[PDB]
């Protein structure tokens, strides 16, 4: 009965995680875009004092999203939201029931957050060399079951956590968006098309094929256009050596 409102933005992979999870849960919920990076509403710190997207409200009285109520629970951090949605919709099996397989899902999420996401940040926002990122992606790929399936076998929130980032990489590369040089851009594209990364391409296809992805993705070209609005992606700018 308790309402869910997700404050969102199309460019944001962190918001995308939570939308995918709500889709897989079969939840009833509201999304409300926020221009967090250019024109933050002055009421936004009431739903998240960290001034980051996503933000979530839960319960309280039904109110327009730009008039959040003090009675709703204010939930921050995308992975905490993923675990919360799993807790709220236990019959949707957003996590395995078996402890070791659940652990595989939590490990995959931590591998992405601890070793991969910062390399994406380095390469795309600072234009540092791509090799440490390719190395971290090979490590992540290796945590996948090699003969197919999702991170923990069956689909789980761990795949919600990771696919927003991997799904952005390919079209952003094809647009040359990000502070890396053309040389590293070509090197990444060749690498991500090579047999070294066949397994992660299968993984990206399997995740994108689910309705939770189709329903929360603007389309490749539209997502590239939203990403061009991100100040830190510095459209037209590239660093060399």
Ligand X SMILES: O=C(c1ccccc1)c1ccc(O)cc1O
Candidates 47-55, 130-138, 144-152, 207-215 — which segment interacts with ligand GSH by CB under 6 A? 47-55
Q: Is residue 68 involved in binding ligand X (CB under 6 A)? A: no
Among 142, 145, 211, 219, binds Ca ion (CB under 5 A): 142
HSE at residue 79, side-chain half, CA atoms within 13 A, is 14
Q: Is residue 76 involved in binding its own copies (CB under 8 A)? A: yes
Q: Is residue 63 involved in binding its own copies (CB under 8 A)? A: no
Q: Is residue 146 involved in binding its own copies (CB under 8 A)? A: no
Candidates 50-58, 78-86, 119-127, 204-212 — which segment interacts with ligand X by CB under 6 A? 119-127
CA distances from 8 to 46, 70, 114, 142, 180 (A): 15, 20, 24, 31, 27
**What residues have CB less than 8 Å from 241, skipping those under 6 apart?**
181
CA 73 to chain centre: 23
Q: Is residue 169 involved in binding ligand X (CB under 6 A)? A: yes
Residue ranges in contact with ligand X by CB under 6 A: 13, 117, 120-121, 124, 165, 168-169, 172
Residue ranges in contact with ligand GSH by CB under 6 A: 12, 14, 36, 51-54, 77-79, 114
């Amino acid at each position: 009965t308790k309402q869910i409102t997700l404050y969102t933005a199309t460019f944001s992979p962190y918001a995308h995680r939570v939308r995918i999870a709500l889709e897989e849960a079969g939840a009833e919920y509201t999304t409300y875009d926020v221009d967090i990076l250019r024109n933050m509403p002055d009421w936004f710190p009431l739903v998240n004092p960290l001034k980051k997207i996503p933000a979530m409200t839960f319960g309280g009285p039904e109110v327009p999203p730009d008039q959040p109520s003090p009675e709703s629970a204010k939930i921050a951090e995308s992975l905490a939201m993923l675990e919360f949605i799993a807790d709220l919709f236990p019959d949707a099996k957003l996590l395995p029931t078996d402890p070791v397989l659940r652990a595989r899902a939590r490990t995959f999420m931590a591998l992405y957050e601890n070793y991969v996401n910062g390399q994406f940040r380095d390469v795309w926002f600072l234009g540092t060399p791509a090799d440490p990122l390719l190395q971290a992606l090979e490590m992540l790929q290796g945590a996948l079951p090699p003969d197919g399936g999702f991170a923990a076998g069956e689909w789980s929130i761990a795949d919600a956590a990771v696919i927003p980032f991997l799904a952005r990489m390919f079209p952003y590369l094809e647009a040359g968006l990000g502070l890396y040089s053309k040389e590293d851009g070509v090197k990444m594209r060749k690498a991500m098309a090579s047999e070294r990364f066949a397994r992660i391409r299968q993984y990206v296809r399997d995740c994108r094929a689910r309705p939770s992805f189709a329903n929360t993705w603007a389309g490749d070209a539209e997502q590239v256009e939203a990403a061009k609005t991100v100040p830190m992606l510095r459209v037209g700018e590239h660093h060399h050596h």
